[PDB]
Amino acid sequence: TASPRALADELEQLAYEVERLS
Amino acid sequence: TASPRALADELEQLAYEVERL
Amino acid sequence: TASPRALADKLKQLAYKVKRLS
Amino acid sequence: TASPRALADKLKQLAYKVKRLSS
Ligand SMILES: [Zn+2]
Numbered sequence: 902t903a904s905p906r907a908l909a910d911e912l913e914q915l916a917y918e919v920e921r922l923s
Numbered sequence: 924t925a926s927p928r929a930l931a932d933e934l935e936q937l938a939y940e941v942e943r944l
Numbered sequence: 945t946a947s948p949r950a951l952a953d954k955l956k957q958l959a960y961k962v963k964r965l966s
Numbered sequence: 967t968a969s970p971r972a973l974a975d976k977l978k979q980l981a982y983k984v985k986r987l988s989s
């Protein structure tokens with residue numbers, strides 16, 4: 902399964918996309 | 924350290940805040 | 945860019961996985 | 967209400983906590 906580190910990496914990528922919202 | 928359950932709860936709350944943007 | 949709803953969906957998916965970490 | 971950057975900041979902080987867990 903995916904490690905916590907892997908899940909955290911995905912969460913950081915999603916945060917960058919949230920940053921582009923208004 | 925915070926529990927996985929506790930961290931998932933925070934993430935769910937933030938997801939709904941994102942949704943409502 | 946990705947919609948708020950699409951991003952919320954992925955975040956909810958991620959939360960499902962985080963909650964099941966051992 | 968909280969801005970997208972504020973929400974993303976909380977998401978990044980949460981990611982840092984998730985990162986600390988071991989598999
Ligand atoms: Zn603890």
Ligand SMILES: [Zn+2]
Binds near residue numbers: 966988989
């Ligand atoms: Zn272990």
